[PDB]
């Protein structure tokens, strides 16, 4: 429909006015989001980029997840430094206070 | 979507879940959304277990598994 340059500027408009602007505020402020993923893992990380599909390059990652051993249930706590994340697996992103 | 060959002739549709419905095919589109008439939920043994849906029924095409024209 629209021209390529207009679509480029439209993407910029959407990133600033749309729902994605929560991620953009955290990316520009360099403050960590929390990301509940589809597999009940929660990432904690600083965003460095994102796109239309909600893919996002993350840095400084911590990744909480939970494991069970019969009657017991326990926390794992992996650390990662640099991580691309495919967007489709994202339930809900927070911005921490 | 070559459904034109069926027209109103009675169809049973397998649907997402286990679910089945059968009815008189009134119309269709490129998604295979299907609108069909006198639709019964084919739940099981007819005299107690089936249900009659309503005078108009439309099915979202992503939920059609397959459809068998039981009229010829």
């Amino acid at each position: 429909e629209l021209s390529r340059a207009e679509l480029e500027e439209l993407e910029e408009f959407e990133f600033k006015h749309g729902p994605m602007s929560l991620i953009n505020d955290a990316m520009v402020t360099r403050t960590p989001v929390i990301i509940s993923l589809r597999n009940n893992h929660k990432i904690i990380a600083r965003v460095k980029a994102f796109d239309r599909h909600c893919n996002m390059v993350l840095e400084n990652v911590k990744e909480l997840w939970t494991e069970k051993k019969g009657k017991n249930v326990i926390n794992r706590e992996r650390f990662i430094s640099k991580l691309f994340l495919r967007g489709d697996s994202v339930i809900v992103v927070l911005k921490t206070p | 979507p070559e459904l034109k060959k069926y027209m109103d002739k009675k169809i049973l549709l397998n649907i997402n879940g286990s679910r089945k419905v059968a009815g008189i095919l009134r119309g269709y589109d490129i998604f295979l959304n299907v609108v069909l008439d006198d639709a019964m939920e084919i739940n099981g043994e007819d005299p107690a277990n089936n249900h009659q849906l309503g005078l108009q029924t439309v099915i979202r095409g992503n939920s059609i598994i397959s459809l068998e024209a039981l009229d010829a």
């Binding site: 960590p32 904690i44 400084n60 911590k62 650390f79 | -």
Partner: protein, 60 residues
Amino acid sequence: SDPTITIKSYHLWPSFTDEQWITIESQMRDLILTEYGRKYNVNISALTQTEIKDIILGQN
């Protein structure tokens, strides 16, 4: 290295505790002295704290 340790809006460095600072400063010592040991070809495990002090401050 741990996003649960935030940087306040009015600050420049993350909000480590004293214990976390001790850990961080030890790791920083290891980093600086690893690069120094590679560059100058010296055994880091043999250095005195006074030599380490001169290396950290960049004397000569």
